[PDB]
From a paper:
Escherichia coli YtfE is a di-iron protein of the widespread Repair of Iron Centers proteins (RIC) family that has the capacity to donate iron, which is a crucial component of the biogenesis of the ubiquitous family of iron-sulfur proteins. Bacterial RICs are composed by an N-terminal ScdA-like domain and a C-terminal domain that folds as a four-helix bundle where a histidine/carboxylate di-iron type center is inserted. In E. coli YtfE, the best studied RIC protein, the center is coordinated by H84, H129, H160, H204, and two μ-carboxylate bridges formed by E133 and E208. We show that YtfE establishes protein-protein interactions with the scaffold IscU, where the transient cluster is formed, and the cysteine desulfurase IscS.
Author numbering: 5 to 220
Write the structure that this text describes.
């Protein structure tokens, strides 16, 4: 029906269920809903019914037409700053569960290192965005940003690669019945991150970058 990006950016709370399990409306945002419902054996399109259910909600803030400077400032305060505060704690929660519940079978061994790699990668990527690309866009130089953007999108793909590993390491970030408090809450912080981290890349890859390259 509609592109994955515009579907999550028009509907106030589609992004949530529109993520469900294995829905990539971020880096592959311009992909059509038919494709996301093609390779992934989804219902023919009752999704649209799900979309129509919450399509009645009023309009909040359609970033599609918002100024690029507001989009940037929004990402810096809502997503960039958030990740820098979430991942350090997850690294500490991972190394505790990997140590405390090591005797368990379903322990997500290696979770602490994959989280650390994602933390290393992201921090490097955001710093580049905030010091190289975002300032370039605010000055109105978006048309010449093919190089810098094309470089950041490659780093977006490396980030997703790490999310899938973290997903697989945690059995689709789903804890077992033996999960104590420091094991369940952690998986919640992981789900919180993927949400904030999918919407983060969705806004950068489907709105900021194309409009900037479009000279808007
Ligand atoms: Fe970013």
């Amino acid at each position: 029906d509609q592109p994955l990006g515009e579907l999550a950016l028009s509907i106030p709370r589609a992004s949530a269920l529109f993520r469900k399990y294995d829905m990539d409306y971020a880096a592959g945002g311009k992909q059509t809903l038919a494709r996301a419902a093609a390779r992934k054996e989804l219902d023919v399109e009752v999704i649209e019914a799900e979309l129509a259910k919450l399509a009645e909600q009023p309009i909040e803030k359609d970033w599609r037409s918002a100024p690029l400077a507001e989009i940037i400032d929004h990402i810096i305060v809502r997503y960039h700053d958030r990740h820098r505060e979430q991942l350090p704690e997850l690294i500490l929660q991972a190394t505790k569960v990997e140590r405390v519940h090591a005797d368990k079978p379903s322990v997500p061994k290696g979770l602490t290192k994959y989280l650390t790699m994602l933390h290393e990668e992201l921090s490097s990527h955001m710093m580049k965005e905030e010091q190289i690309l975002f300032p370039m866009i605010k000055q109105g130089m978006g048309s010449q940003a093919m190089g810098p953007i094309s470089v950041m999108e490659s780093l977006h793909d490396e980030a997703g690669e790490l999310l899938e590993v973290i997903k697989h390491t945690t059995n689709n970030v789903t804890p077992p019945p033996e999960a104590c408090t420091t094991w369940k809450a952690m998986y919640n912080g992981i789900n919180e991150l993927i949400d904030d981290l999918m919407d983060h890349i969705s806004l950068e890859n489907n709105v900021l970058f194309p409009r900037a390259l479009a000279g808007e």
